[PDB]
Amino acid sequence: PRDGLCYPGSFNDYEELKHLLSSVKHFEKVKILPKDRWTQHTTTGGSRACAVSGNPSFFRNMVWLTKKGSNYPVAQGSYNNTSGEQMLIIWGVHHPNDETEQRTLYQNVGTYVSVGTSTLNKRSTPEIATRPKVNGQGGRMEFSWTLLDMWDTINFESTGNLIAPEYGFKISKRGSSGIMKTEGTLENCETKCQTPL
Amino acid sequence: TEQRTLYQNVGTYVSVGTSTLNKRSTPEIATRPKVNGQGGRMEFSWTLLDMWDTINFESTGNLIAPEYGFKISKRGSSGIMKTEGTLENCETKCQTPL
Ligand SMILES: *[C@@H]1O[C@H](CO)[C@@H](O)[C@H](O)[C@H]1NC(C)=O
């Protein structure tokens, strides 16, 4: 696929996530952390790697937290799963190219991005290093995911380099499915057995 | 104490980055049983560098930097034989450990 991660980076347990979708037939997006509540931080941050119409932009479902008025207070974020079914949540960590980028974007060094649920406990820290430029950007964005169970709570805590999510992907329909690796296009037709050919 | 006399810096890092790889590592100072008379350890990592790609090594200490890269030239069917024998003058088309 040509359109993957517009901002260079990786996706932890990406192959496992594609295996989960093989038994999921429908997602009902739920706004778990609206962009408006981040009133103590700047949420308009964008990159040329995500440019649309010649202007910097960013992923639609993710929020790039940034310093507001030369201040970066601790990012508090929580959501209690009340959607009635298991919900998939994706967050990310930003790795600046150099320590100067760290200062001009978050102003705090040695920041942490921690995510905790009733069954998950993770703390991540940015890795500042010199890397070859991909899509013109020297930084990287590492994205991680988890499944939030019934009536469970997920807490987001970070002093910097947190790409907080805005929407959760609630599973609604489950059943037999799969992924076709094909370059064809959908056509008006009906069948009971589909092959890539 | 070994940190001072060998690198003089504390909290050093060893970072390696390519177009598809991003790794930062730090030394782990601890007391371990002496193997080969040495209490220290060296952890060795590897990667495959693609066509026309760049790899950057940066470290403030504890880096065992390489001198040679192992370019792949010929590819094909091969294998690793687990045997105690020795090569001898002979020709064959099918080889078994026995
Ligand atoms: C989350 O919501 C459920 C149902 O409303 C409730 O039982 C549970 O106590 C809530 N979690 C917390 C941490 O309050």
Ligand SMILES: *[C@@H]1O[C@H](CO)[C@@H](O)[C@H](O)[C@H]1NC(C)=O
């Ligand atoms: C590496 O070399 C190739 C071919 O010489 C070149 O196209 C590429 O730009 C070089 N990489 C960098 C980072 O300059």
